Symmetry: D3
Subunit: 295 residues, 6 copies
């Protein structure tokens, strides 16, 4: 009937998923406890489910789309493969949020020279397949300890000698006196689709959503810069701030000496050149938002 | 009262949107979660947070100046007062662009519905007994009313009633309770209302100022400022696809005699519907920027 | 410390605005009492407001965002113990506005500051209150309360209070009248006295350019409209821009142009009807996130 | 079917209702969100509903029992009567909790105030029917202002000159600079039953529950007191602490001079006589709970 | 080191576990808690992780549902392991049934043939369906299993039921019970130190005391001496009634008897018929045979 | 000032235990989460909920009558007031049986504190201890989350409250030296109360004593052979001596009842069974008086 999208029930990843859908024009009036939501303007249903359950729903084709971390997706792919299955899906887009590293970590006091220091250790993780593959590949024997949450407390708790867990800022490792020693997997959120072909109408909607997703991602760190400069300085200013193609050049009232120039720029690059712009005579410099860009 | 007084809902999505609207209209305020009276820090305005069902009566009695409330709640209370022999009045200033919902009759999915006569003699649970009563009496359907203040959707399962009359936006709550929406009896959105009795000249002048801004906000809702590059020779075709609110702005590009920038205001969904055709006609570097207010 | 360290308030509206300011200055973070920026070498320490000045005075954090009132209260406390606290003021910011004021029950008669003579006065800012009363030669009994100061008169803890006021709602809620303002405050960005490394100072400099950009754009919008060419001078007189209007051609139109001007938003609304009288149409108000001279 | 009991969804009254049912042998697990609960040991369903909705459900006979404040019950009775209905119900028991006074209150002035001070005032209340009846009965004209909550803020908000609202401790009135001037109604929680006769099996269960309710209520504020005293002091001690019938008298090991005495007592009465008990030679005085008492 | 007890992080089972430990004399006030009066550490962990910690011997004791224990036992066995533990006590809380359920509107188990069935307990479901020769498609969901049919994620579910309210709220009918569970207290297989085992033994005496007292009360009443035998026949006590003199009274006595509370209420009117008065019901916190 | 005024903590386990104690002493009240002044509904008593650190000063200045507060907070504030030249005083009514904690010096996992920056919320208590032991240090006053200071590089060490030790362990800190031990106490302002207020305090205090004397005691009942009375009495003596009660139609066995500390009971329970005890019951005691 309607296109079905599975998203995470909780975490920063869930909030960013809802925001992405909203920016892609999916209106939804969603109670905190509602597990199935129905878009009010598009034929789309949103299913809020535990992250670890999303890959299996996509593998089995009972939802159409999913937003999920690569780590969770591959963990579950490996699990299904280990049982003799052949899970498949389509990767539509690697997204610009949910960034993390799956890393081996040890108490700060422990001595680490190389990977062989994990030989024979109990290692606590929520990703036992990803860990198993890596340790097999490197020929390191270890004892697995599967924990669903609070993995960082396992060494202190004496449930394990070490951990393999997700790191973003590194604050959680530090708070628990752990040192990140080896990155085994890098992940971000991705948008995936079931393998079996959709109806023409559903696929057409996916295509429309994907155009907007690309628009959002393209605009993400970019702003629309406006400024005034002497006409004679056009070339110097263009060399510093080129725009996505070339500056727009706009007349100013009763002024034949100066113009307004407009350029799209990544914001951090703008700030890195702002003083040189002033040195070349730029004034009244404005930074405006861009919600979507299509190049 | 020295200062203009505005009543808004204490809770719900409607309350958050009311606060946001006031903020976009230049009313600075800090509403702590507990604070029931807030004072604007930049304008002579007091904001009273009150239960939605109480707001119409405060306006009818003239003890607040303005109110933001759902049409459904307003009319439910208007009907209640009229049933008691009163003549409530107010001024409708603006139908707003949030708080959308339908008040609908709904039945368990298993129940057979052919027409309105299937509600004959049923117990119907609702929080809007006056709106329901009017509709059923207009259609000559007898029924037994069951007033419930909340969780109306659970009444059939709970065996408190055979059916319900409740607000629907997405339909998720009906589906979650195995209910089918059968007949819409009322459609509602948030509105801004004013008491009947004339305000002082200074208060009315402030209302007038606020209303100019409210119109600006509402006219901009769902519109964006589109910018793009195109070959000069394509201007007529691109203008046909994306006309702007009057006509495209045409802007030169540095050291380029072949291409220009074109800027147009567009409803966002119309923009997306024509975006591929724009690319087919040579458009590139297409940007979508927000518009906060628009005056035609 | 390898990384630049910034102390911000753990709670309050001031805390949320501090986080937003840092975000608008390009500091990505997911905020936990210590947070690590994911894109810049910056650590954010969330601490009780009253503790921030001391950390800056002692040089164990590099930057702090704190109310002027809290900063001066702690400066006075340290000075009273014989110390010489110092810091660098980087910027007076545009949020956290409040007044520290003497207030009395509405029934109490107030003619002069002398009406506080001999009263018990409850406050969370005993140093600021002490200085003011000493300066005005008013004797009083201090009552230090850490929170809910507004309830002290009703609770019979004190005859009066000295507390922060923003909207005045809390005083009204408690049947109190604001009688005398003793200190006005807003948030400020401060730095420790001892010189930073060249790399840290360079980062602070970068952040400060952005802070100025944010503050200069506050309340300004980018206005666009259409008008007859012959009306340019009248419209420019009403809405001049930050320098002068941008003037743009319209498709297949030789009579009308688009005009764009930066304007403070309230000034815009005050001239909008005159703009329409002079033939302006399709008037748009767009946001500006930063503005630089 | 099963016996159906409506209780309040929130408030101290809701917690006390659940506790009473538990002490009457009704086992149930009410999840925070669950609106219908099913007792696991008895054929009883518990419906959690807004207080103001309970009377109507009892009047219409669609639940069997209800626990509700007298004030809410009578307010709704008057409202239904005003619409031409004939609500009825059976009062089973006036309960031990939910005590409050519905009172007229005015902003504090430094001057005695009284009932006649309400002539012509706007009075805010959530109980317009109870207020109306009282004012009519006392021939006081006034203007009604119905507010569903936070009635205490109405004078400060300038929505009314005065209020009629519930008072328990008086703290809320004092916090809002209001003076309680006239009590118009006194209320406690009640257990009520629908008018139409229940099935024999349902009525038999109600009868069982009611025996227990009486047991609980009868025991409230009573304790089982035990003490040692010289045999010669029996009569003096019995005069001070008589028991519900007469003291139990128990031998002590290898002691012909002293006995243990046990007496049920209201706890406050116990504390009021405790020093006189010691003066008469009582020692090792214990206060034990009593969960139910039957005459 | 200190005795280590793993308990659930959340759920009613978690609260009852804490309560039981408190009634057994363990004072405590966080994912690792340290008892303030005994050498005991309490680890709060997700229920599904507890069995593995016991199997591997890295905690000493655990309080966990039988269902979760057996689910994990089966999982480990399916991987070729030989998990073991000691069952110390089947406890008196955490009751639930793991049941197959279907949308309201089933003749027999063959109606599940070929269905997609959503569950959080795939090993328990798999074993049952294999044993009954029913083919099905598994759908593993970690939570909110009851929404799967409505969400079109599965045709049916296999989930825990206590009161049945959740099934009814989702228009589901409980059709077949496949496993019944309560909380149990378990211990790792490898022997503890003498000191740790001695503490476990102490705790277990108290656990028995708590369980034996559950639903029993201490009944006291007055009756005419001549009615002793009739009253004893109705309310016998755990051994025989205590008989106590009343002040200056040769005609009546107090009688005290332990009774299950529901049995007491069932005979209370007959007690009054036989002349009982001033009947009191007092709590009992522990009882030992 | 018509009614007796009692200040209690606004939050913390101490706050809950304070409310529970008052309730067990017969003070009925409904403290809404927000309410800062509560009025007892059955006694002329007002309860003021205030931040712990503010309570001592209110008692010192005599503007509330009674307070329940940790000894640590009381003494910290006493020292602060003394350092300013004041002579704070109060009456200690009772050391209570909750709020137990240790104020301890702790380091990342005593002479080694020389010259360290030490973070604390109790700078007066720390100062006194370090002066007394002749250790120089740099004070860092933090109002909360003191345990994070070393990791945050705000200090080298801390002086903070410990109950279970979990918070120190969670932050990789080792408790090295206890400087102060504390529990909740009930205190009264120095200046004499009215006769009516003092009489109410006296009544409350009789009940407080009852509660505290019963804490950890239970009423034990059991059956035993008459011939075993002396052996059982030796194991479980009661607070004075066992109550001895006949059993229906039984000349050989009796019921015996004894008050016992609960842990002592459990320590002797197996010996009781060895001596023929059966049907052993443990009942609660809510108050006990000498
Ligand atoms: N993408 C993610 N999905 C799930 N957990 C995450 C993710 N990124 C970080 N975490 C966890 O979130 C917490 C914050 O990470 P950090 O910022 O490194 O302190 C840690 O417990 C991480 O293991
Ligand atoms: N404007 C509104 N005011 C009050 N409740 C509403 C409103 N719109 C929707 N609801 C409630 O939200 C739920 C319906 O939302 P939905 O599930 O999206 O149809 C029902 O519980 C409605 O009573
Ligand atoms: N900048 C500030 N910092 C801390 N507290 C504040 C600040 N501004 C206002 N308050 C407090 O916040 C409450 C609301 O202020 P008002 O808007 O005056 O009711 C009062 O308790 C004030 O004392
Ligand atoms: N039985 C009751 N039902 C509903 N509200 C109550 C009841 N008793 C007291 N209240 C309200 O609860 C708050 C506390 O009352 P008080 O103890 O008088 O401050 C006030 O807002 C009262 O109006
Ligand atoms: N021992 C348990 N462990 C986990 N979940 C449970 C347990 N017992 C009941 N539940 C869940 O709690 C909810 C309430 O059950 P019920 O009382 O049948 O509505 C349902 O989602 C059950 O699946
Ligand atoms: N009486 C008390 N007053 C204030 N804080 C306390 C008290 N007892 C313990 N704490 C704090 O409560 C937390 C828990 O203590 P612990 O049980 O040792 O982890 C720690 O942050 C202690 O500093
Ligand atoms: N011409 C500018 C800005 C712009 C892009 N698209 C439309 N205008 C650039 O190339 O960056
Ligand atoms: N000229 C364009 C853009 C614009 C509107 N207003 C100012 N500029 C349009 O009519 O849409
Ligand atoms: N030229 C207009 C708009 C503008 C500012 N900067 C760039 N463009 C003004 O001076 O306000
Ligand atoms: N005989 C005592 C205690 C008691 C009552 N019932 C049983 N025992 C009394 O009359 O109060
Ligand atoms: N003798 C009573 C009460 C009792 C049990 N244990 C001690 N006393 C009974 O057998 O039930
Ligand atoms: N006689 C017993 C029980 C008891 C105390 N007080 C009254 N009875 C004892 O001395 O412990
Ligand atoms: Mg999994
Ligand atoms: Mg109404
Ligand atoms: Mg300070
Ligand atoms: Mg405050
Ligand atoms: Mg702006
Ligand atoms: Mg009603
Ligand atoms: Mg209220
Ligand atoms: Mg598992
Ligand atoms: Mg202090």
């Amino acid at each position: 009937t309607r296109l079905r999208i599975a998203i995470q029930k909780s975490g920063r990843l869930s909030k960013e998923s809802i925001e992405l859908l909203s920016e892609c024009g999916v209106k939804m009036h969603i109670h905190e406890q509602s597990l199935i939501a129905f878009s009010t303007n598009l034929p789309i249903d949103i299913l809020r489910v535990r992250d670890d359950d999303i890959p299996g729903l996509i593998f089995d084709g009972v939802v159409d789309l999913g937003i999920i971390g690569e780590n969770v997706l591959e963990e579950n792919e490996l699990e299904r493969q280990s049982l003799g299955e052949n899970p498949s899906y389509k990767l539509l887009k690697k997204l610009d949020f949910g960034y993390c590293r799956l890393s081996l970590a040890l108490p700060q006091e422990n001595k680490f020279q190389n990977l062989k220091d994990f030989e024979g250790l109990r290692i606590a993780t929520s990703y036992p397949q990803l860990l198993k593959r890596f340790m097999k590949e490197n020929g390191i024997n270890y004892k697995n300890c599967t924990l669903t949450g609070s993995v960082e407390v396992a060494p202190r708790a004496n449930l394990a000698d070490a951990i393999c867990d997700l790191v973003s800022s590194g604050a959680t490792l530090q708070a628990n006196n752990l040192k990140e020693v080896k990155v085994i997997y890098e992940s971000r959120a991705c948008l995936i689709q079931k393998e079996n072909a959709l109806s023409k109408e559903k696929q057409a909607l996916v295509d429309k959503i994907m155009l907007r997703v690309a628009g959002v991602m393209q605009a993400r760190e970019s702003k629309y810069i406006m400024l005034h400069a002497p006409k004679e300085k056009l070339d110097k200013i263009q060399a510093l701030l080129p725009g996505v193609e070339r500056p727009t050049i706009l007349p100013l009232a009763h002024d034949e000496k100066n113009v307004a120039l407009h350029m799209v720029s990544k914001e951090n690059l703008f700030w890195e050149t702002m003083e040189a712009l002033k040195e070349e005579g730029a004034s009244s410099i404005l930074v405006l938002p861009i919600e979507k860009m299509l190049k």
